[PDB]
Amino acid sequence: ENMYVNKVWVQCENENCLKWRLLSSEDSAKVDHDEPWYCFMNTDSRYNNCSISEEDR
Ligand SMILES: [Zn+2]
């Protein structure tokens, strides 16, 4: 059942990293906007660590 959830960009809040990450529809729905978000919270295994380069658009 499609919930029509946007794929959104979020910025990592590790001050050493600050990289932007494009989330799946599912992860976009799950983000808790009252808590900090960090790269390791991304379930996309290609871009889920602060040591990984930012994706190109
Ligand atoms: Zn990061």
From Swiss-Prot:
The CW-TYPE zinc finger mediates its binding to trimethylated histone H3K4me3. Changing residue 20 to F: Significantly reduced histone H3K4me3 binding. Loss of histone H3K4me3 binding. Changing residue 9 to C/D/E/H/K/R: Significantly reduced histone H3K4me3 binding. Zn(2+) binds at residues 12, 17, 39, 50. Histone methylation reader which binds to non-methylated (H3K4me0), monomethylated (H3K4me1), dimethylated (H3K4me2) and trimethylated (H3K4me3) 'Lys-4' on histone H3. The order of binding preference is H3K4me3 > H3K4me2 > H3K4me1 > H3K4me0. Changing residue 9 to A/V/L/M/G/S/T/N/Q: Reduced histone H3K4me3 binding. It comes from the Eukaryota. This is Zinc finger CW-type PWWP domain protein 2.
